[PDB]
Each structure stands twice: as structure tokens, then as C-alpha cells.
Amino acid sequence: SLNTIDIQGDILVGMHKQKQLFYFFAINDPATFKTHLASDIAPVVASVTQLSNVATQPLVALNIAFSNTGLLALGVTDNLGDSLFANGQAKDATSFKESTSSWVPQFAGTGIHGVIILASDTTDLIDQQVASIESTFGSSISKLSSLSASIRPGNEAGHEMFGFLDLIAQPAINGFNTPLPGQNIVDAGVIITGATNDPITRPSWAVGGSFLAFRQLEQLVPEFNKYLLDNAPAGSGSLQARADLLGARMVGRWKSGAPIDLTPTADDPALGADAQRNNNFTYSHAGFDLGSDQSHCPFSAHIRKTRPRADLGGSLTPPNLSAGANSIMRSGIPYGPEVTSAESASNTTTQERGLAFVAYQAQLSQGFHFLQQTSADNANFPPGKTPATVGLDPIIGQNNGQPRVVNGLLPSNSSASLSIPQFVVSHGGEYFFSPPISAIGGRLSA
Numbered sequence: 472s473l474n475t476i477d478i479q480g481d482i483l484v485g486m487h488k489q490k491q492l493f494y495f496f497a498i499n500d501p502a503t504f505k506t507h508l509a510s511d512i513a514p515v516v517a518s519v520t521q522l523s524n525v526a527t528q529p530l531v532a533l534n535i536a537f538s539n540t541g542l543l544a545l546g547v548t549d550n551l552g553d554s555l556f557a558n559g560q561a562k563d564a565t566s567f568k569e570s571t572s573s574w575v576p577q578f579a580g581t582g583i584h585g586v587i588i589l590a591s592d593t594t595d596l597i598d599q600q601v602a603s604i605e606s607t608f609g610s611s612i613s614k615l616s617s618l619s620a621s622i623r624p625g626n627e628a629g630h631e632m633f634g635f636l637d638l639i640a641q642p643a644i645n646g647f648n649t650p651l652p653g654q655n656i657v658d659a660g661v662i663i664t665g666a667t668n669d670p671i672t673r674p675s676w677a678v679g680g681s682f683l684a685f686r687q688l689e690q691l692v693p694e695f696n697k698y699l700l701d702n703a704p705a706g707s708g709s710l711q712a713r714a715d716l717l718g719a720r721m722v723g724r725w726k727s728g729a730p731i732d733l734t735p736t737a738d739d740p741a742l743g744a745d746a747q748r749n750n751n752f753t754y755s756h757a758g759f760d761l762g763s764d765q766s767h768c769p770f771s772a773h774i775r776k777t778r779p780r781a782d783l784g785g786s787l788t789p790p791n792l793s794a795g796a797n798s799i800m801r802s803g804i805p806y807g808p809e810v811t812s813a814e815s816a817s818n819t820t821t822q823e824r825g826l827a828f829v830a831y832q833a834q835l836s837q838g839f840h841f842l843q844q845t846s847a848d849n850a851n852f853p854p855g856k857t858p859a860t861v862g863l864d865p866i867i868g869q870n871n872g873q874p875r876v877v878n879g880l881l882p883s884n885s886s887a888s889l890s891i892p893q894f895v896v897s898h899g900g901e902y903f904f905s906p907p908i909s910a911i912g913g914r915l916s917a
């Protein structure tokens with residue numbers, strides 16, 4: 472059975488707070504650090520059970536995860552069963568056709584030992600917790616870098632910086648979640664190390680944890696907006712409506728959350744808002760060839776790249792259950808200032824904003840790394856299409872800084888190709904292990 476009292480809350484349900492801070496640290500003195508890990512951190516680590524009850528939301532929700540070098544620092548030399556985690560994300564950068572030369576320097580190495588995720592409805596409360604941690608740990612912990620993040624304001628709450636409603640679609644864990652129409656249903660061990668049908672043997676103390684892939688992804692919002700206007704397909708509606716259609720073709724959903732597969736020519740804001748309906752699709756349509764039909768949703772659309780559904784086989788009617796092992800739980804949150812008037816007017820980014828991307832999975836090679844390398848960056852994925860060259864994911868696909876060729880986006884002609892500049896720019900990140908809560912004051916403090 473899944474022991475959710477022992478699982479850190481961000482993994483399965485998110486922090487449920489307006490503000491987050493990602494505090495990236497080194498461990499200078501493992502003896503003193505361990506003492507305070509047990510006494511000061513472990514008691515305030517928020518569990519899935521705690522965060523799932525409206526009566527037990529803490530003022531500051533706190534989670535903590537460790538990199539490979541952070542575990543080594545703590546004298547933990549165990550094999551957690553994940554080569555990508557052990558090697559660190561910087562060594563993995565080439566797999567995604569990017570260079571660490573573009574990264575925040577602190578990420579371009581393995582000096583980061585962990586991340587504390589602090590979440591609260593105000594930054595003042597976060598800052599107070601940080602001050603407390605720095606006081607009680609002294610120099611045994613040291614801040615290397617940090618990133619502040621926030622839910623976006625007003626009617627954009629829950630939307631990412633490009634304006635799209637986010638975190639709609641997640642895997643349902645069999646026995647834990649009540650599945651929604653269309654939602655994939657997966658074994659707990661796809662997300663939680665050592666849980667049901669995780670095929671990789673783990674250290675005993677690590678059962679109930681998950682690997683956290685962190686990415687600092689800058690978004691070029693004015694540039695994206697202008698691109699859509701400049702490349703809007705011809706049609707009867709306003710120019711902006713036609714630009715909106717192109718954006719929806721790139722993401723696979725309208726900004727409202729309505730999936731284009733179910734409403735291919737216009738938004739349906741009521742559909743987007745309804746969790747019982749907004750995921751109820753497989754990409755299959757009777758009387759259309761799945762291998763060639765891009766009239767409902769392009770093969771290159773972001774969500775189709777990241778959850779192929781019927782493109783990888785399985786049921787043509789909902790729920791499609793394909794590629795469960797390639798599922799990730801997402802807890803990303805936007806960062807940076809809102810787009811200013813001047814930036815919008817000049818169509819030019821002058822301040823850094825984007826997504827503090829957080830993905831959880833039990834195997835990095837099957838989750839984040841797979842989705843980036845085998846799908847988003849792969850012009851021939853999904854397989855079996857006609858024509859075969861799908862092109863890259865227009866949102867996250869990478870090709871060493873060059874414009875991405877993306878096919879199928881234009882409804883009038885599925886063979887029409889666009890060469891699209893990057894609108895998402897990686898500043899790097901790291902792979903961490905979020906341990907079960909018992910390990911925090913247990914093995915890791917021993």
C-alpha cells in the first residue's frame with residue numbers, strides 16, 4: 472500500500488501556495504548539518520496527507536531534496552538505482568542539445584547538494600523560515616543560489632507565462648487518485664521509488680521518495696506573442712483570433728485549457744474549465760487515419776509530444792493508457808515579473824521570466840529525460856506518421872540554439888513547415904532525490 476503520510480507533499484499534490492522559493496545549498500559540515508536536518512527540517516516537512524487536508528495546510532510548506540553529491544556529503548554512498556541522477560544534470564545537458572555554457576553557473580557543475588522548497592502565501596513567511604534555517608544550521612548549510620516563483624495574478628492564476636492554463640493533466644496513480652475522464656492510470660512505482668511495480672531495486676530508506684528534475688526555463692513572452700501574429704493562418708476571424716489558433720496548435724490546448732483535439736477551430740472556455748471533460752481524448756477520431764490526420768491536433772503539439780496517447784498504441788476510446796512508464800508528475804510554477812508595458816510594446820524581453828519546472832518520476836530515463844530527448848527534440852517522434860517528419864516540439868524542442876523545424880501546425884496544409892525560434896531558453900537545473908520523510912531524520916541524519 473502507498474504510505475502517503477511518509478511522502479513529501481510536492482511530489483503528488485503540489486504545495487498549494489501563492490509563493491515558492493527554491494533554495495539551492497551546499498553542505499559544509501555534515502555532522503552539524505545532520506543534527507539540524509533531524510531537529511529542524513524533518514519535523515516541518517509537509518506530507519501528501521497533510522497537504523491534502525484543508526484543515527492542515529501549514530503556514531510554510533517545506534520539502535527538501537538532495538543531489539547525488541549532497542547524498543555523498545552526508546556519507547550516503549548507496550546506489551539509488553538511477554544513473555542520470557548519479558551523474559547530475561550538467562553531464563546530461565548534451566542529451567538535450569543544449570550546453571551548460573548557457574546555464575546559471577551554479578548549475579554547471581555538481582556543487583549543489585540539495586534544494587529546499589519553501590512555499591507560503593507570502594514571501595515574508597518564506598524569508599522567516601530561511602532566516603531560521605540559516606540561524607540554526609550556521610555555516611553547515613550554505614546558499615549557492617535561489618529562485619523565487621509565484622502563481623500568476625488574477626485570472627491568470629494557474630496559467631504559465633505564455634498565458635495557458637497549466638497543470639491540468641497528470642497521471643492518476645492507481646489506488647490513490649480517482650481517475651478523471653481520459654486521464655492515464657499508472658502504477659505508483661512510476662512516480663514513487665520502491666512503490667508498486669517500480670522495477671528498480673532501491674535502498675530501503677529511499678522507499679517513498681521520487682526524483683525531482685528541476686529546470687529553470689526562461690520564456691520569451693513578447694517574442695512568442697509577436698510570432699503568432701506574424702504567422703497567423705489566413706481565416707475569417709480577427710488577426711488575434713487567428714494568432715490564438717496558431718498558439719493553441721503549438722500547445723495542444725487553448726489558453727483556457729480546452730484541448731484542441733476536442734475543439735479544433737475555436738476555443739471553448741467552458742470545456743477548458745471542466746476537469747471532467749478537458750482531458751477526455753486519445754487523439755483518435757473514427758473515419759480519420761491516426762497516422763496522417765493533423766486536422767484535430769498536430770503531431771508536433773506540445774501535449775501530444777509529452778503524452779502521445781493513441782500515437783503509442785492502446786485504446787482509441789478514452790481512457791488511453793499507453794506509455795504509463797513515461798509519465799511525470801508536474802509541480803512547476805512561474806517565475807519572474809509579469810510582462811511590462813514597454814516589453815509588450817517593443818515585442819522584446821528585457822527581464823527574465825519563465826517556468827520553474829519541476830517533474831517527479833521514479834526513473835529519470837523514463838520521465839523527464841525521455842520526454843525531452845526521445846520526444847520533444849526528435850523530429851521523427853511520434854513514430855509511424857505520414858509524413859514521418861513530425862518536427863520538434865514548438866514549446867520545448869531544442870536543437871543546439873537553432874530555430875526548430877516544426878511540421879503540421881497549419882490546419883490548411885499539414886505538409887507546411889515552420890522554422891520557429893526558441894521561445895523557451897534553458898538556464899539549466901539539477902536532478903535531486905526527494906526522500907521519504909522517515910529518511911530525513913532517519914538515514915540521512917545518521
Ligand code: HEM
Pocket residue numbers: 631632633635636637638639640641686688689690722724773774775777778799825826828839842843866867895
Ligand atoms: C517553459 C516550458 C513549458 C511550458 C510553457 C509548458 C506548458 C505546458 C502547458 C500549457 C501544458 C498544457 C496543460 C496540461 O495539459 O496540464 C503542458 C502540459 C504538459 N507538459 Fe509542458 N510546459 C513546459 C515544459 C515542459 C517540459 C520541459 C516537459 C517535459 C520534458 C513538459 C511536460 C508536459 C507534460 C507531460 C504535459 C501533460 C501532457 C498530457 O498529459 O497530456 N512540459 N505544458
